[PDB]
Amino acid sequence: GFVNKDQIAKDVKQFYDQALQQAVVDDDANNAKAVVKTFHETLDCCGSSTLTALTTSVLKNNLCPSGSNIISNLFKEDCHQKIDDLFSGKGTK
Amino acid sequence: VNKDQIAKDVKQFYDQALQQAVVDDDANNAKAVVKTFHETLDCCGSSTLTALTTSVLKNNLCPSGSNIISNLFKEDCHQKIDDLFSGKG
Numbered sequence: 701g702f703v704n705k706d707q708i709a710k711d712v713k714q715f716y717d718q719a720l721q722q723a724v725v726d727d728d729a730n731n732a733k734a735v736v737k738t739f740h741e742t743l744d745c746c747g748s749s750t751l752t753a754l755t756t757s758v759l760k761n762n763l764c765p766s767g768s769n770i771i772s773n774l775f776k777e778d779c780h781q782k783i784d785d786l787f788s789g790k791g792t793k
Numbered sequence: 794v795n796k797d798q799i800a801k802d803v804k805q806f807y808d809q810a811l812q813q814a815v816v817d818d819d820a821n822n823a824k825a826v827v828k829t830f831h832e833t834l835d836c837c838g839s840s841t842l843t844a845l846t847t848s849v850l851k852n853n854l855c856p857s858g859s860n861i862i863s864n865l866f867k868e869d870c871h872q873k874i875d876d877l878f879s880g881k882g
């Protein structure tokens with residue numbers, strides 16, 4: 701089966717959103733938090749939007765990339781944007 | 794979204810880009826996608842696609858530099874995609 705770039709990007713974001721929501725709402729969600737932490741470290745982001753990345757960095761900072769200050773989350777791309785960069789070949793860096 | 798299904802689809806997407814990248818004909822986007830996957834996930838090709846992997850490696854789509862062990866001991870992109878969705882890191 702052929703894979704469409706836009707559709708796969710949408711599914712990944714959706715998967716990540718499910719994970720983020722579980723990691724934040726509920727502690728002890730060990731695997732959601734692991735998935736979220738892996739996405740955040742790999743893509744260098746901390747949220748589905750600028751606003752959720754800021755919120756996560758203030759309230760659940762352990763989920764954010766190491767050495768991440770709060771205020772960078774205001775200016776850095778969010779995880780949805782980094783997922784788009786990945787599949788379009790823009791570059792995560 | 795099912796974890797197994799999405800990891801499968803992303804690997805298939807990566808495989809598609811890999812085979813397109815080997816053709817140097819209006820595939821500059823596929824080359825960028827392959828290179829982006831390689832740098833983001835820290836991998837180079839897949840053990841399941843040895844012929845393609847050898848070609849992109851020669852096309853300098855697995856650039857070296859940081860982590861010298863990772864320059865000689867390349868990681869499988871399929872495994873790294875699996876690690877991404879399993880949260881293994």
Ligand SMILES: [Cl-]
Binds near residue numbers: 794795796797
């Ligand atoms: Cl699942």
Ligand SMILES: [Cl-]
Binds near residue numbers: 840844
């Ligand atoms: Cl092979």
Ligand SMILES: [Cl-]
Binds near residue numbers: 850851854855857
């Ligand atoms: Cl190379």
